[PDB]
Write a protein that binds this ligand. Sequence first.
Ligand SMILES: CC1(C)CC(Nc2cc(NCCN)c([N+](=O)[O-])cc2[N+](=O)[O-])CC(C)(C)N1[O-]
Lengths: 214, 217
Amino acid sequence: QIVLTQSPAIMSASPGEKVTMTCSASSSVYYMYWYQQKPGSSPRLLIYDTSNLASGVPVRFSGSGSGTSYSLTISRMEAEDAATYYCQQWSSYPPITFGVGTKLELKRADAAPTVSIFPPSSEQLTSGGASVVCFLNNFYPKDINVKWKIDGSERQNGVLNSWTDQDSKDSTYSMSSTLTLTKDEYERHNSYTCEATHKTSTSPIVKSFNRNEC
Amino acid sequence: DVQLQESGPGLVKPSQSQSLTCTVTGYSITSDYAWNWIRQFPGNKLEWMGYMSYSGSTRYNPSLRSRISITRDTSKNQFFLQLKSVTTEDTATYFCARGWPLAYWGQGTQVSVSEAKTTPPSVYPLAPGSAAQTNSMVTLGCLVKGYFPEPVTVTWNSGSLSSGVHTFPAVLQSDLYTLSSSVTVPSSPRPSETVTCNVAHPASSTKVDKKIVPRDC
Ligand SMILES: CC1(C)CC(Nc2cc(NCCN)c([N+](=O)[O-])cc2[N+](=O)[O-])CC(C)(C)N1[O-]
């Protein structure tokens, strides 16, 4: 039953800056708890009973809240605090519920995507498949488009993109675009071009391999 | 320090019943506290499932109260979650945790509910197809495709090469996953200094090393 809605949903702050995120209960709650979670790690307790700090928790963190409206504040955001923050409630057993997290990301200078394209390995072709991979690496902001052209025309079927979350050390995003084909389809075309467009340049970065190579 | 470690079967067939075991270290499950089982769905959603009070009593989430059952073994300091008739929708990662307030969580175990089958990964090298002027840096990589289930673990030059690496998040190819990793080395150490990708797949007990060599000519 009792719903927890959080604000903001994705938040980009710079190190040294002040941070405040909100968690609203749809109905009044006895206390609120706040958790921190990094990709792969389990949830860590931060603030318990609305405003109490947990044991391993730096005093840059701080919880607030009257009935139904609560908030976790990071006074000066550190780079290590880049993570997703959940609120969770205790009221009269609905049961205990959790928000869906507010995502805290780190701010940095616009970076331009290093585009690369790879033809399928001889080994891959032997199985009857042929994938064409395009690594759009190390860019900021995360907003990109990738266009695929097999022999001049624009394709949309067979493309699979995966994105990495913000890099551990330089704070940038990277994304692999893979076009999958079958050996025979692949061998009735000659230009495979991977075309990326990102905020840091109106003209796209087009990397093109052509099936007459070496 | 109190210590919570869940575990149990990683792959489960629809309509069968899963059983996870949480084993706790450093504090007895009979002297104070409520012992919880909480699960985290893909994306982010945490769900409370139920708890065992130190005295024996259980409390469960009202939606899952027909389907799940929590139990214990005080001689082995263990409490268990049993999931009856599992649907696709129970695919998630299950954490046990020390109750009220929820400090002390287990590291998390993944349960995959699928009719699919433990296939090992095919790993193919990715090397430059000539292309054009770009820079003083080589990007190469590995296409780890065709496996079930998650995870595989990709490393470059046995862990020697940790900078410049980008292992991309897996995606379901055709109800088996494809995943890929990129490493960007200086053009001077290539190919004088050998780069190689080491893939590993726990479920199928597979390790495959794969040397990236300049291609074709
Ligand atoms: C133990 C502690 C410090 C944490 C409690 N937290 C708690 C306490 C309880 N039950 C208290 C029993 N009336 C439950 N519960 O039953 O789900 C949940 C929670 N929780 O989610 O944090 C809140 C109070 C102020 C009662 N206390 O005393």
